[PDB]
Design a protein around this nucleic acid. Sequence first.
RNA 1: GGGAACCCUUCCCAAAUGGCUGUUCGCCAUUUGGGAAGGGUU
RNA 2: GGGAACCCUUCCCAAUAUGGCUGUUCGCCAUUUCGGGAAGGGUU
Lengths: 457, 439
Amino acid sequence: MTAFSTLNVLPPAQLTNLNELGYLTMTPVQAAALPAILAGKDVRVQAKTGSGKTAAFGLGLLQQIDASLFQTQALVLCPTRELADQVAGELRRLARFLPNTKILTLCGGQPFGMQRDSLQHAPHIIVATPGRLLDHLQKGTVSLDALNTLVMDEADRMLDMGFSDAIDDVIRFAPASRQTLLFSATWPEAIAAISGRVQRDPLAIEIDSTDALPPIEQQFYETSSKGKIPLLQRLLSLHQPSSCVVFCNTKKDCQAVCDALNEVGQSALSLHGDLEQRDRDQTLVRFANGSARVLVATDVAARGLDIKSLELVVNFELAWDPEVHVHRIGRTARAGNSGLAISFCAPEEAQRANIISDMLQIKLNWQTPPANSSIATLEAEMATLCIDGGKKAKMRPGDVLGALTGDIGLDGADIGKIAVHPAHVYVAVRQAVAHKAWKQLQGGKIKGKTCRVRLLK
Amino acid sequence: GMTAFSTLNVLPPAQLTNLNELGYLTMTPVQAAALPAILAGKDVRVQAKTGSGKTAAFGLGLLQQIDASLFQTQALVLCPTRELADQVAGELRRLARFLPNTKILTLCGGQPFGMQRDSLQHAPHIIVATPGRLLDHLQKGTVSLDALNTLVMDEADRMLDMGFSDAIDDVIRFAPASRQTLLFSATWPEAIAAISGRVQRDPLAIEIDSTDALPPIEQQFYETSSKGKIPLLQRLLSLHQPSSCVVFCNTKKDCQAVCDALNEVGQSALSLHGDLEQRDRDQTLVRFANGSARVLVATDVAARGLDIKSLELVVNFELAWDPEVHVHRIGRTARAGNSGLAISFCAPEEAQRANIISDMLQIKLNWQTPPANSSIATLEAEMATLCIDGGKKAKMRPGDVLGADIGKIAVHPAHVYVAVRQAWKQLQIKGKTCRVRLL
RNA sequence: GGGAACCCUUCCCAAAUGGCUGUUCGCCAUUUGGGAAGGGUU
RNA sequence: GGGAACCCUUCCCAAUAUGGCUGUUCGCCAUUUCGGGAAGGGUU
Ligand SMILES: Nc1ncnc2c1ncn2[C@@H]1O[C@H](COP(=O)(O)OP(=O)(O)O)[C@@H](O)[C@H]1O
Ligand SMILES: Nc1ncnc2c1ncn2[C@@H]1O[C@H](COP(=O)(O)OP(=O)(O)O)[C@@H](O)[C@H]1O
Ligand code: BEF
Ligand code: BEF
Ligand SMILES: [Mg+2]
Ligand SMILES: [Mg+2]
């Protein structure tokens, strides 16, 4: 039985679901905030990165859901589309105990009409970005009149000056009689001091201080701005990370670093706001399932993204905000693992490095690189097939896996992550078998129907 | 005397060629008389006998005022039955071939409301509808008559009866006050004629034929008891051996009972009444029209408007309550210049109905003696109907589906019906393969 | 700077809504989905 | 009477309409239907 039983609130169906999902022990933040959340209290939570906040507020809000009432009862706000999709997926996993629970995500990039159509049957839980959610609110396709609880993940980001007007506009559509949860790994005392405007007598649950990170080893390298790309290529060759995320402060630098890494054959994809949304989603899929070694991103990937066993984070340029520095490195060392975060520091970034040293109360570990080091190739172990259909075509992972193991004649150990999206299914297969799987699935059949299959770039 | 459509001096050469292609060689009397005033924009109330071209008479008039570039509703036509609405729409489509990209939509019950709502996003130029579903669409804002030029009521004496009065009034409140209004019918009791002027604006009354001037229909009456009508009917069918026949009854119960009594004696008979599924009604009409059945037993849902080509025989199993309904029934035969036969049964209690018919038509009844009472003869259907899934939404023009072993081809919105000689397994078209059912 | 939204064009591809000759395998027309590329919004 | 429209219930069949469900497939459920039948009730 799972430790969650000590809460003495969750139904046995949810306890069994947690046991099946492997949630055998409550993380500190779950143990600390779930009583108060299930009691209906407003909370502002500060726990370290990759320590279970999603389940912390998800179990809480799921406990107060009436599946028979097809109106929206829970609303979760995220700062980026990929993070919205991610926490929506985790909530759907946590909601298996309660059958026929509709969890819908509302972000830009998707066409507005398909979402308007899916909203005719109101979803129980909405996970959303502020722009598209406010668009749907002003046009009367979403009602918050039945809203029990409103969650703001990355709440210090949702309450900054950028999102402030959009948030104030959204809350105007929400009841005053609502539970309001705020979760983050960082709380600048400014955003913390103003956060009371959206809550009603909240409990401050600050279990992890600002300097209490997960087991992340940090290393800093002095370098001129011009030497950074050579140094990055040499360091990637030295470390040989199974996966790595490189962060830049601008999309121009992001794409430039991606291209410079690819010209030396270090398998790299780029993720920033100028990409189309299909490209953003597919890029994240491919990096997560092993179809690329390095992901180069702007701060659109700094927060919340849960990439499993990510081995390395590199700060090409230190982030403007030390809070964002903490979130970047937090992409590694999640769910109890360790990680490494290398950071470059040019003379213009001295102030950023000093503020990081002060905030984390650590003496920075400056590494000198080897005198000479060659540049090595980094090839991806996997490649991603994109099958047309998704949840709209009722494709569950068992169908793709059984078709791959049987009819097409592929080994069960040559297929990695299966990610079922609303309109497509992404499969990871080893690079040797990729073209074979593509050609045979072309004229093959999954779940009886014949489908369209693309090999992603 | 003959008059060509060019004598109207209004119709474009495209429309003149279209009429010549469709076999409208010379105008009928109702066309020659009503079309000048209709094209001049006058409201008209028109009488003309059955099977004399009233449909084309008002259709050409309203098509002359359509602007195909403006994709709003500009012409509305109301019908008493769904099958008649479909038929009038089809004739209007054939007449509208001179005008490319002309949307004529039919709004009737039985068909789902959602597909019609979707089709209404691109507003049609012409709507042919029954008042129920049309009013349902109007009140729900899916149809707008703001740009309406012409409103037409076929079978207007029925459209203005007490049953349809309120629905019609409801529909008119959505239409513009400045509109052209055309009322057409084969019959006009002077009471309903007097009340009809409320929907019109200075109408012109054109009574082409006096009430007793019918098409060349031979009328024969038979005395019979109530029971025994079915035996006498079976015997008359065995005697005359009609290629196509229509049997009218006053009740759906009698209709279905007569239909099944005809079927159990081996006489191919279909039924048509309001208690049927709408797909069933449409398929029944298609099968009876293309020759897949010899006899059609129907209620007064088939009394008005329907144009079955070269229908050979009509019988009144029971005389209609109203003589106006009687003339509409027999009018199903002897259409477009053909002759016909109309046999009527007369029980003791319907004798006064027979007498009122005699007075209205100013004809003395020709009573006939019963022929014989032996050997119920067979009446096999010459054709059989197959249903292809596809229709107009699958872009199936008749030529695609397409010798002389196949009769009529009926291209519907969702299906295509074809009559073959007395195909399925070999078909089970236009590149794509399709589902085929045997009716 | 980085996210989070949108409007204005202007051409492709595909599909909703119709039109087109009783010897098929297609051609139009309007609309809306992305595929773009052009400018503008917070 | 006969048409032209519904509304209640209450069971079928159907709908990638809207969702839910085991990582060795070809399926199983839920709601809605401005989708079709049945079987009683009513209404215009
Ligand atoms: N109780 C638990 N036991 C084991 N794993 C857990 C537990 N709770 C969460 N996880 C997993 O650990 C990771 C933490 O993800 P996340 O919820 O995003 O942490 P955070 O939002 O605080 O950064 C996820 O993969 C989550 O599924
Ligand atoms: N001018 C014409 N020449 C030849 N046939 C015609 C002409 N006008 C109509 N018809 C045909 O004669 C029949 C009359 O159908 P219809 O117009 O509905 O008669 P009704 O006057 O009773 O409404 C139909 O087959 C129609 O196509
Ligand atoms: F704090 Be986590 F990475 F959302
Ligand atoms: F008068 Be007809 F038969 F429409
Ligand atoms: Mg998180
Ligand atoms: Mg007529």
